[PDB]
Amino acid sequence: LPHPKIVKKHTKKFKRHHSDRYHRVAENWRKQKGIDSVVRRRFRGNISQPKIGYGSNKKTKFLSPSGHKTFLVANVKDLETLTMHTKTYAAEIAHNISAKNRVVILARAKALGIKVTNPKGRLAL
Amino acid sequence: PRKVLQLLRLTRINSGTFVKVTKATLELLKLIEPYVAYGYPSYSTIRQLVYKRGFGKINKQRVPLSDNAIIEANLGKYGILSIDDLIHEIITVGPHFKQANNFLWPFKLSNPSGGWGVPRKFKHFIQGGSFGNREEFINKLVKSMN
Amino acid sequence: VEPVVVIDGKGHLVGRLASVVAKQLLNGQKIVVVRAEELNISGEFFRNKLKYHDFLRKATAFNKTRGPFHFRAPSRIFYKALRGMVSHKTARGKAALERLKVFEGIPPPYDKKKRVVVPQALRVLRLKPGRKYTTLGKLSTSVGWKYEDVVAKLEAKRKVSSAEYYAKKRAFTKKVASANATAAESDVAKQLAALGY
Amino acid sequence: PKWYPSEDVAALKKTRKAARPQKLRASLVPGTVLILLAGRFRGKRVVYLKHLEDNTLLISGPFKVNGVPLRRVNARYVIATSTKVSVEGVNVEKFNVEYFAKEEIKAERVEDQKVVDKALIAEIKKTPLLKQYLSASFSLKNGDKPHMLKF
Amino acid sequence: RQSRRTSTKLKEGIKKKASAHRKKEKK
Amino acid sequence: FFRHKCKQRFTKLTQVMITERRLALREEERHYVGVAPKVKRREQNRERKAL
Amino acid sequence: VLKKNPLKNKQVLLRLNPYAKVFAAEKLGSKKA
Amino acid sequence: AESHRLYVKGKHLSYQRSKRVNNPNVSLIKIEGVATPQDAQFYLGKRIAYVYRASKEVRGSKIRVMWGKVTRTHGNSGVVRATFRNNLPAKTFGASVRIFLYPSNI
Amino acid sequence: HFKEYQVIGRRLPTESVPEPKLFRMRIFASNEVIAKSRYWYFLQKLHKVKKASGEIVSINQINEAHPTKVKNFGVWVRYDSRSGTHNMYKEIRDVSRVAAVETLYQDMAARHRARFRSIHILKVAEIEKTADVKRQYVKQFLTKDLKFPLPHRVQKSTKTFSYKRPSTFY
RNA sequence: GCCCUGAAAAUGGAUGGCGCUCAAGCGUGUUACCUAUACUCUACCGUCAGGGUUGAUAUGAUGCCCUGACGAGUAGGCAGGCGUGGAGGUCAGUGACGAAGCCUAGACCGUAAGGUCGGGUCGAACGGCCUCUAGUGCAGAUCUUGGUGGUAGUAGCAAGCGAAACCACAGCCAAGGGAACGGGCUUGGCAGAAUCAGCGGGG
RNA sequence: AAGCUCGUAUCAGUUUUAUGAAUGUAAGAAUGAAGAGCUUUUAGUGGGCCAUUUUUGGUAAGC
RNA sequence: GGAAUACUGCCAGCUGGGACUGAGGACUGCGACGUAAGUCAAGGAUGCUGGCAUAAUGGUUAUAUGCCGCCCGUCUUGAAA
């Protein structure tokens, strides 16, 4: 696709305050709530908090580096819905689909012209 | 004074407008002295102001000017039909002034190209400041703020 | 420019000199200062001799030994002065006073190699003609430095052994300035001149 | 073109930029001596011959002088020196863009070299030291501040 | 020896001495 | 909508008679092999023992 | 869509005010008395 | 024979900063001999390379590079502003940067 | 920097009082508007008026008559300070009326800390004949054939590193 | 007007440091330059407001657009989502050719809640979607239980054996940090790994 | 937050003129705002300190 | 007596150098130039050329340097405590 140049806005992960100091407090983002907190009051130098401005360009949203939207395919029927959107969606084979089944999803997607985001999954030579 | 600045439409800092000058307003400009830099425009500056920073109120919506028909439509009521017609109504304070002025959306002005001149912005111009009446000099300022 | 700019205090103003010597390391500039002792300053003598001792007293309480060490020897006097305008303490700093070097006298290998000065900082050229102005040498001494002489003496030597040098050179040139003179005025030359050279 | 679009791409708006021919900086008048700033032949003195259709310049050393073939080159990667030669004796109109396709050196290309070069050498031989000037390499020397420098 | 730093309690305890000189003059 | 979207389907489906283009120029000495993780032990823990 | 400004860009300075063609053929800024 | 230099040798001074907050995108360059903003205008928009050896060989050469542009002047001394692709490292504050002569206006 | 401004004002003509007295004064200022502003301030010190009660009739610049000649300038100055105001007179050897009042203002700052708001310039007059010159530092140049040197000449260097070791003859 | 005098002690001491003297000080003037989340302009996000759009639009009119303005926030209010156990429905869903779980100096997405994939371990069941339902989401409670540290091979047993109290985190001075607050900050002095024995020294 | 009338000439921490003993009432005065009023109900809220400007009592002062 | 020239102000005067940006996506509109045909700098970037598959490039982690960053929660009091 002659896609627009995808602007990422904020590439760093939004970690949680103090998720580094304590092993109990986790990297999963949670707002700070104490009114004596500096993070909540966004003093200089302190960690960047997720606000709505970091929101991605609606034209480019969901678009992966390939410039395709990710899409999970379970079986060879589900794949063949994108028969029409090869230029736009990328057949992510789903993680639990076996070896014996995958090799079959790859047969079709190659034939149809669907770019599979995850080939070589379980599969060897 | 804060109330009064709002009544001139001088909301954000570096915003600029025109004012019809009588007894009434010449007492307002007294109140807002420390907050503004007011003076007498040329034909020229207006002309520079209006082609670059000139915008039109239409129901709400700050609309860009850039084609005469717009003013022809919204202000054709008052015998203004071009942009230069508009200018004519500003410079010579015309009979439809209140309308043509009000149709113009209060100018947005970038900080001066060359700086303010002074070190300290908040003294009366007369004693090496910026605020208040700077008469003709205003035209050197606005054109750096254009 | 030049990789090493051996300076030379001899009539500079501890300050100023410094500053610049400073900036220059910060901007990656291998310097080297010489004749520290012939560094100068501003003001009477019986001053710097204060604006110092005071400095001296300083020192630490409970443990005098651990504290503001009062160096005597010129060089250092002036060092300080400078390690005082260079965020010394931080890589980029250390990384400097790394680039520095301040000898009293003018020992090899520098004796043998051109030095220079730093306008923007000579007594002569900054001090309103005729005004009180101190001259390290004394000022060091007056407060510990035990050598003023060695330097001195083991100086005069240098100067000598040099000037001598000089000559030999002055003699040399002359010859050139003479050859060129004569074999000057023949075409070739001429031409040049036209262009300028 | 016969194959109907299997996918829905929207066609472009009708774009409004006509290509206009490139206006070269004043100093470049065919048969000028140049310095090349970048390339295999960076630092060489090189003669200007013809401005091209691809906004480039056709230039030769010439090859018999400094070892620069008939080459195209870009306008900005060159300093124009004031020294001009006679260029009007040269036939240049043979070479255009298409002269420079590739789909061990071609024996056709070397024949055009010597036609140009011998029709050029003559004019360089008139001026003193120019044959020598061209063979040398331009460089900057300590104290050449190139905002001061005249070319 | 004396210092030449103004401690802030003084630097602002000058303003609060200067303010007292303003109200003194009026009366 | 149809009038066109059909022309469209028709095409993409026709330009997928390009399976023959995969299946004539086949003869590929590769073919996908499943790795079962039982095998990926019997053939890993048995070598350590052989050695 | 985009604000072309007169003053620069002649072409827009002809859509606003057709007179400026006439202002430029007579020089008009450069007027002698 | 002695020189192959087709560039002006400047040093990398800092990042444009304040007292407190540096932006590392704008590298400040001193150039050789340039004293004014006027003399600098010449250099505006020429390509800079910062050059350095690294440990490991990459493309048959241990000798890596970064590239970038003089963008505008800075104060009066002729110190100039400069932006690179990847920013210059800070560890290189006070290092030599080769400033080139393409693109010519001359 | 300064310019001289001839200003006249007349307290707007009321009924039965047609065309009043007209007050002419030469004001040194930097611009026409400082000039006007200064003008009313002086009006309030001469008599009872206000800026709204009167009108600036005519404000016109004055250029110096011969600015390739060197005159001597006897200047009367009223100025305020920490104490109550007090009259003064100095002398200035100069080129132009305007550069004179200028160089006076620097001196009035340097010696007496007084700023432009404080100083009234009373009257500036050329002195034609010598011996009317009452100040020594002016009389000092009014001798036949004054030949002197400027010893200890600072040569301002652009480059930080000088190899010559600078000598200051002239 | 500037300058000296115009008294203030007691751990070493501060125009912030260095240092400055036709200044890097004082007064004044002129220009140049430096930089904020301020202002200008462009893009983007979102929200609000105004609208367009059907003998139907080459995408769900609860769509797809067009224009403009706006964006701090505690108590509090309103709204849209993300996640967990179970229920109905559905995907003729996934699954020993390896379900779930667990790791992972691995990849992608989403502002985020989170979601997806590869590699490794693993061994039997599980997931999306539309709705239901609730014992549903943790950093704290001198929380509850369980597990494990430093203290420590120390006190100790009236070469071996072997605790506990305690534990946000570290522990150099000097000055400044307005609030009987200095321990992290600002400006300095400084500072070389590693360890044993004193005082009865301070907190 | 919903409902009803309007969508206006509904007003404004503003100036002016007019009329009385800094300050009252009006405008066929200016400028600004399409965001107003009437129902009905529903959360959170009862901290002071500093500065400014008028005074009032104040003696070494401070206040 | 005769010009100038600075200064202030104007130009819908001309000619350069540098950085940032290229939103949008058939055509409609306002125009300009041309006798017309048409063309255009006119409702937002097009054109040419170069670099690659043992790639190009992009990332992860460990540090380094510059600059910034008081220990989280709760509860008082006007906040710091």
UniProtKB/Swiss-Prot annotation, chain C:
It is found in: Cytoplasm. N-terminally acetylated by acetyltransferase NatA. Pfam families: Ribosomal_L13. Gene3D superfamilies: 1.20.5.4280, Ribosomal protein L13. GO terms for molecular function: mRNA binding; RNA binding; structural constituent of ribosome. There is a cross-link at residue 175 (Glycyl lysine isopeptide (Lys-Gly) (interchain with G-Cter in ubiquitin)). The keyword Hydrolase does not apply. Keywords: Acetylation, Cytoplasm, Isopeptide bond, Ribonucleoprotein, Ribosomal protein, Ubl conjugation. One of its GO terms (biological process) is negative regulation of translation. Belongs to the universal ribosomal protein uL13 family. Component of the ribosome, a large ribonucleoprotein complex responsible for the synthesis of proteins in the cell. The small ribosomal subunit (SSU) binds messenger RNAs (mRNAs) and translates the encoded message by selecting cognate aminoacyl-transfer RNA (tRNA) molecules. The large subunit (LSU) contains the ribosomal catalytic site termed the peptidyl transferase center (PTC), which catalyzes the formation of peptide bonds, thereby polymerizing the amino acids delivered by tRNAs into a polypeptide chain. Present with 43300 molecules/cell in log phase SD medium. This is Large ribosomal subunit protein uL13A. The gene is RPL16A.
UniProtKB/Swiss-Prot annotation, chain E:
Residues 1-8, 16-27 have a biased composition (Basic residues). It comes from the Eukaryota. It is found in: Nucleus. Present with 7130 molecules/cell in log phase SD medium. In contrast to other GTP-binding proteins, this family is characterized by a circular permutation of the GTPase motifs described by a G4-G1-G3 pattern. GTPase required for 60S ribosomal subunit export to the cytoplasm. Belongs to the TRAFAC class YlqF/YawG GTPase family. This is Nuclear GTP-binding protein NUG1. The gene is NUG1. The chain holds residues 6 to 32 of 520 of the full protein.
Swiss-Prot record, chain G:
N-terminally acetylated by acetyltransferase NatA. Signal peptide: none annotated. It is found in: Cytoplasm; Nucleus. It comes from the Eukaryota. Changing residue 23 to A: Leads to an inefficient release from ACL4 with a delayed assembly into the 60S subunit. Belongs to the universal ribosomal protein uL4 family. Component of the ribosome, a large ribonucleoprotein complex responsible for the synthesis of proteins in the cell. The small ribosomal subunit (SSU) binds messenger RNAs (mRNAs) and translates the encoded message by selecting cognate aminoacyl-transfer RNA (tRNA) molecules. The large subunit (LSU) contains the ribosomal catalytic site termed the peptidyl transferase center (PTC), which catalyzes the formation of peptide bonds, thereby polymerizing the amino acids delivered by tRNAs into a polypeptide chain. The eukaryote-specific C-terminal extension harbors a nuclear import signal and delivers the ACL4-uL4/RPL4 complex to the pre-ribosome, triggering uL4 release from ACL4 and incorporation into the 60S ribosomal subunit. This is Large ribosomal subunit protein uL4A. It comes from Saccharomyces cerevisiae (strain ATCC 204508 / S288c) (Baker's yeast). The chain holds residues 312 to 344 of 362 of the full protein.
Swiss-Prot record, chain H:
It comes from Saccharomyces cerevisiae (strain ATCC 204508 / S288c) (Baker's yeast). There are 2 genes for eL33 in yeast. GO terms for molecular function: structural constituent of ribosome. Coiled coil: none annotated. GO terms for cellular component: cytosol; cytosolic large ribosomal subunit. Keywords: Acetylation, Cytoplasm, Isopeptide bond, Ribonucleoprotein, Ribosomal protein, Ubl conjugation. Component of the ribosome, a large ribonucleoprotein complex responsible for the synthesis of proteins in the cell. The small ribosomal subunit (SSU) binds messenger RNAs (mRNAs) and translates the encoded message by selecting cognate aminoacyl-transfer RNA (tRNA) molecules. The large subunit (LSU) contains the ribosomal catalytic site termed the peptidyl transferase center (PTC), which catalyzes the formation of peptide bonds, thereby polymerizing the amino acids delivered by tRNAs into a polypeptide chain. This is Large ribosomal subunit protein eL33A. Component of the large ribosomal subunit (LSU). Mature yeast ribosomes consist of a small (40S) and a large (60S) subunit. The 40S small subunit contains 1 molecule of ribosomal RNA (18S rRNA) and 33 different proteins (encoded by 57 genes). The large 60S subunit contains 3 rRNA molecules (25S, 5.8S and 5S rRNA) and 46 different proteins (encoded by 81 genes). Pfam families: Ribosomal_L35Ae. One of its GO terms (biological process) is rRNA processing. It comes from the Eukaryota. It is found in: Cytoplasm. The modification N-acetylalanine is found at residue 1.
